[PDB]
Amino acid sequence: TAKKFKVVTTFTIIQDIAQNIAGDVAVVESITKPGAEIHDYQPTPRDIVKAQSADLILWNGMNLERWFEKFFESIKDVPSAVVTAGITPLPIREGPYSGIANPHAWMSPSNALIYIENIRKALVEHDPAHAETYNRNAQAYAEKIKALDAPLRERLSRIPAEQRWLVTSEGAFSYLAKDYGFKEVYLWPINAEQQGIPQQVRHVIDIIRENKIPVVFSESTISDKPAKQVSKETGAQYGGVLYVDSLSGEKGPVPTYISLINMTVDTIAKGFGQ
Ligand SMILES: [Mn+2]
């Protein structure tokens, strides 16, 4: 066991999934730090150094990392793999990114199994000496992720179908909402320039009052102020922060991809009174 195979990912969700597949034969590190906004992140010379010293670079694609392809052109002779191949996208519904793929596919546990398979194939291709370890680790982790779905589905099923309205800041929850039958209301369709402008807030407020939706949420890498503004003006309680674009730090409450799915579903369910 000389030097461990080095994997660099764009952001922390992929880092944790890939580190579960890598086990102890590879070290996986994220370019973005926990808590940092991932869509419009601006890479630094230090990021170039991290990617250039990698043996493999992983990214989401599906229009997530607006920075990645320009960044990756600086990187020489490091292979890359997009980890969303074979996932059927949901289009963004409005705004200047309307009609392109919603990137947040990892929020569907079923989609996470495809992430796992894509990361497995990439590690097996570019570090074939350890293919057996990658294959064994991916099969074990896919088992955990597959088993994850049923208790989450049952928990959210307790909410009456008619009242399944998921009101968030970014429209980052479309894939989770589809899996578990939530209608989707958000202050902005995808992180970009306009985030909490009028017209956005007033539409969401109208939807809330018409349907008496009991809770609204923010997310961990953006400002909670628009969501709190919405809850102040309506009957809706502020449900807290959901996790989608980033894990917490390893010593925080959301250190892993499994903990992120569990925490986000728990917080939603609690916002509805379980
Ligand atoms: Mn996002």
UniProtKB/Swiss-Prot annotation:
Q: Name one GO molecular function term.
A: metal ion binding
Where does the UniProt annotation locate this protein?
Periplasm
Keyword annotations for this protein? Answer: Ion transport, Iron, Iron transport, Metal-binding, Periplasm, Signal, Transport
Write down a Pfam family by its short name.
ZnuA
Q: Does the keyword Signal apply?
A: yes
Biological process GO terms, please?
Answer: cell adhesion; cellular response to iron ion; iron ion transport
Q: Record's InterPro entries?
A: AdhesinB, Bact_metal-bind_prot9, Lipoprotein_PsaA-like, ZnuA-like
Q: Does the keyword Cell inner membrane apply?
A: no
- Which family does the similarity line name? Belongs to the bacterial solute-binding protein 9 family.
Put simply, this protein is called: Iron-binding protein YfeA
Annotated source species: Yersinia pestis
Q: State which gene encodes it.
A: yfeA
